[model samples]
Target: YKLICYYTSWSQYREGDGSCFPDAIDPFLCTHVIYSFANISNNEIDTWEWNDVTLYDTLNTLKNRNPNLKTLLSVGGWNYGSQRFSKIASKTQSRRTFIKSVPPFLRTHGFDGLDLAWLWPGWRDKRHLTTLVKEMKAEFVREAQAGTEQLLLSAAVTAGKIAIDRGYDIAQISRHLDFISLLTYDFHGAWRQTVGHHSPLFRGNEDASSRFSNADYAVSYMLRLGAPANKLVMGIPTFGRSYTLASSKTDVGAPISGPGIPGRFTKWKGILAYYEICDFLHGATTHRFRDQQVPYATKGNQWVAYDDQESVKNKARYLKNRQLAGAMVWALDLDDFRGTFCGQNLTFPLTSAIKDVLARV
Candidate 1:
C-alpha cells in the first residue's frame, strides 16, 4: 500500500527559488518518483544537454537523503504529439531503435524503470495499439529475462471510457506492467465552458449519473474490464481547476460572465504549486465544504477548486474499500510545506491517512 509520487518534470526544478523544494517531501515516503517527458523531442529533455546529468545528481542526492526511493523516467505526455508515437509503433525498426536507445539512456541517467504516458493510441484508428503494447511488453520481458536489473514498467492511462476503448487493451497490458495509473481527476474544469467540480463524488445531485464521477466511473470500469485491483493505482490531482461563478450556490455547468479560472491563477501556466497556494492563502479567497471533504475559492470574477485533508482521507477510504493497490498524486511539487493544503502537506496527509485507513481494513 505504498504511495506513488509521480513528478511531472524535472525541467522546472529551479534552484535558489523559495518555491522550489520545500522541507516536507522526503523521497523515502514515495514508492516511485517518475521524471516526466524523457522522450519528448526538442523539449527540455533533449534541449538541455545536461538534463540527464542533473537528474542523476538530484536522484542520487535524494537517495542519499532517503534510501528507499525508486526513480523512474516517464516517456511521452499529453502535450507531446501522438503522431510520433504512431510512427514509432508502426514499424519494428522504430521499436528496436527505441528499446536500444532507452536502456542506455536510463543507465546513463541513473533511472530504475520506465513509465509510458502515451495520451491516445487507437484514436482515429491511426495505429495498431495492440501491437504497440505487445512489442513494448516483449522488450521489457526480453531485457528482464536476460538478467538485466529488475526494471519496473508502468503506464499512465486515461480515466474515461473513450481513452479505454481507443488507447489500450488494459487486461492484456496489465500482465506486462507493474501497475496502471488511472488519472481519476479532471472530471470537470474551466475547459468545459461551465463551472463544475474538478473532482466530485457526484455530478451535482445524489443520483446514478452524479455518482458516476470521473474517479468512480473510471476505476469501476477498469475493474469490470478485468484489470486486477492490486495492479491499479488511482490518480489524484494535487491542484484543482475552476470557473467563473454566477452565484455562490451555482453548481458546476452554470454559465458565467468571463473566462474560466484555474486554481492558483498567478501561476496559471505552472499552476500554483501547493506550497505557494498555502503560502498565499492569507490573501487568497477560501471556501470550506465538510460534506464533500474538499474546498475551493474565488477572487474577483475568478474561481479556484482544490482538495483538502478530509477529501484525501475519503479517497483513501474509497481505495481501501475497492482493494486497490494504492493511490498516487500527480506531482509532489504542489504540496504545502507546513500542511495547509492537507494536514501536513498534500502527499504526507494523503499517504499517512491512507495508511491509517488500511490499518482498519
Candidate 2:
C-alpha cells in the first residue's frame, strides 16, 4: 500500500552533488525511490558517472534519514531499450551476463531491488519479451538458491492496449515480479492536433473514437489481461499539459488556437514547477474547474490541464473502490506546497489525498 516516487539518475542526480534529494525533501511521502536506467551507457549516463561508491553513499544517507526507505535500480528506459534488449533476451550468455551483474551491483550500492523499464518486450520489433521475462525469473530463482539476498523485481509498463498486447506476457511476468507499475498518464496532450483531456474518463468528444481515458480503463484492462488487482499499481501524473484557448466556452480538448501551436505540455517542459505555477495563479494566470478537476491559465490565450486536490480525491475514491494494489506519483517534486486548490491550501498534496482515501476504504 505504500507509494513509490521514482528519480532519474541522469536528470536529477547527474552532477554528483547531493542537492536534489536532500534539498527538496522528496523522501517524505514516498516509501520507495527508484534510480532510473542504470544500464544505459551514453553521454547522458556518462555525465552522471554513477559509480558504486557515490550511489551507495547517497542511498545510505537516504536510508539513514528514512528507515523505511527502499531503493531499486531500474534498467532500460524508453530510449535505452532498443540497443541490446533483443540480443540479451535471445542469447543465454547475454542474459547470464546481465543476471550476474545485478547482484554485485546491488551489493555494491546497498539497494533493495531492481526494476525493468523496457518500452515494449514483444512489440516494436522486439520479439523476445516472453523469453526475456522467463529468463529473468529463472535468474532470480537461481540467485535466491545461491544465497543472495532476496532481490525485488518489478517492471514499469505502458497502459495502452498495443503496449499490453505485445510488450508483456502478463500472467507469466506477474508471477515473477513483485508488482507492475503502470504508466497510466499522458493519454492526451498538446501532441494531438486538438485540445483534449490530458487524463480523462472516456474520450470527451464524439469525434475521437478511442475510449481510452479514466483510471478505470487502464486498471480494468490490466485485470482482464490476467494481472491481479493486488499486483498492479496505478500511475498518476505530477504535472499538467497546457494548450492555447481559442474560446472561453470550450470544453476540455476543444479546438483552440494561439501562440505555440502543437507542443508538448509539461510542468518542467512548459512552465516551471508547481510551486512556481502557484505563484503565477491569479496574477499571471486564473483558475477554474472542468470535468471535476482544477485547471489554470494566464491571460492572452494559454490554458493548462493539471490535477488538484479535488481531482486527486476523486481518483483516490476510484482506487479505493477498485481495491488496487496502490498508487504511484511520477515525480514527487511537482506539487504546490502552500497554494490553495479549490479554496483549500494545498497541504497534504496528491499522495496524502490518495492515502486518505485508501485509509477510508
Candidate 3:
C-alpha cells in the first residue's frame, strides 16, 4: 500500500512543538514522502525556500534509513495559486521549458519523482493543464529510455465534484500520471457561515449543505469519471477546521460567528493541528456522529471538527473496502510527532491507525 506522506517545507518555520524539520521524519512510517514545494519561475522549475538546497538534501537522505521509501518534490501548492500554472501550461514553448527541467531537478536532488500541486486549473485553463500533463509524461518517458530510473509523475487533485468537473480532464490526466492524490479534506471551514467537519467520510443528514463534498463522494465521483481504483490515493487530513460558534448552538450546521481562536503552538486561526485539538479536548465537550464517522469538540464558543484514531481507522477501512490505492496524509507535521499531546502516549496515532488497518491483508 502506498502510504504517501506530504512534508511541508514551511513547517520548519513554525515555533516550538509546532515546528517540524526534515530530521524529525520517521522514514519508515511512509512508503513515499513528498517534500512540498518547489517553485515555477520563468517557466522552469525553481526552489522557493532560501534553504531548499539544504532542506532537500536532508529530506532525501532519509531514504538511507528506509531504502524502500520514495521521495517526491511537489510544486505549486494552494498558496502558490493557479495563475502561475495557467500561464506555464498555456503555451508549448513554456510547457516544454518546464517539462525539460523536471528530470535534472529530481536527479540532482535525489528525488524519486515530481508531484504537481497546481491548486487547480480553472475552466479556461483546464485543457491546457491536461496538455501539460500529457506532454510532461511523454518527456518523462523519453528521458527514461536512456537507462536511468523512470521518474514517477503524480498530481494533487481537487476533491469536490464541481471543482473536479471545472478543473480536470479526468480520463485524460488519470491515464498519464502514476496516481492522483484526492484532496478529500477542507470541504468546509470558518470561511462559511455554518460549522461543518472539513473531512467527513460521509455526508450525514445534517450535511445537506454539502451534497458532494465528503470522502466517499469524492472517491465515487473520481471512479465515475474513469479514474482507476489502483491509481486513486485518498487523502486524510492531520489537522482540524475550526469555528467560533454563535449563540448556544454547536452542532454541524449551527451558525458560526467566525474562525476559532488560534492554537498556542499552531498559532493559526480557524485551524488546529491534531495535537492542538488534543490539547483542546482537555475540558471540551465532544459529540461523535457515527453517521459522519467523525467527531466535533467544543469548549464554550470555540468549536472544531477533526479526525481521531477511530475516524482514521474508519476511513482506512473505507478505502480498503473500495480497493482503492493507499492513503495520502495531508501532512506529517500536524500529527502528534512528539507523543505527548493526544494522551495516547503515542506519536502519530492517526497515521499508525491507518497503517494498521491497511496492513491487514
Best candidate (score: TM-score): 3
lDDT of 1 by residue, 167-235 (tens): 778778877788888888766534555555556643444233445555877888999888899999888
Q: Per-residue lDDT for 1-361 in model 2, tens only?
A: 7576676554343222211432344455676777765663421111124453565467557877787787777777765655466656666666666766676567567777888777766664344665666676666677777676677788888877766776677877787788888887766644565555555534433454577665567788889878998888877666666666667645545566632233221223343334444444555554554442545455446666666566666776666677778777765545543334324555436666765766673
Query: Candidate 3 lDDT, tens digit per residue, 12-40?
Result: 88888888888888887889899999999
> Quick one: how many clashes does candidate 1 have?
7
Off by over 4 Å in 2: 10-19, 26-28, 41-56, 81-83, 122-127, 146-148, 201-208, 245-250, 256-272, 284-298, 336-348
RMSD of each: 3.8, 4.6, 1.2
> In terms of lDDT, which candidate is strongest?
3
Superior candidate under TM-score, 1 versus 2: 1
Q: What is the lDDT, from 0 to 100, of the residue 281 in candidate 3?
A: 94
Would you list the rank order by TM-score, best first? 3, 1, 2
Q: How far out, in Å, is residue 194 in model 2?
A: 1.3
Please give the RMSD of candidate 2 to the true structure.
4.6
Estimate TM-scores for all models. 0.83, 0.80, 0.98
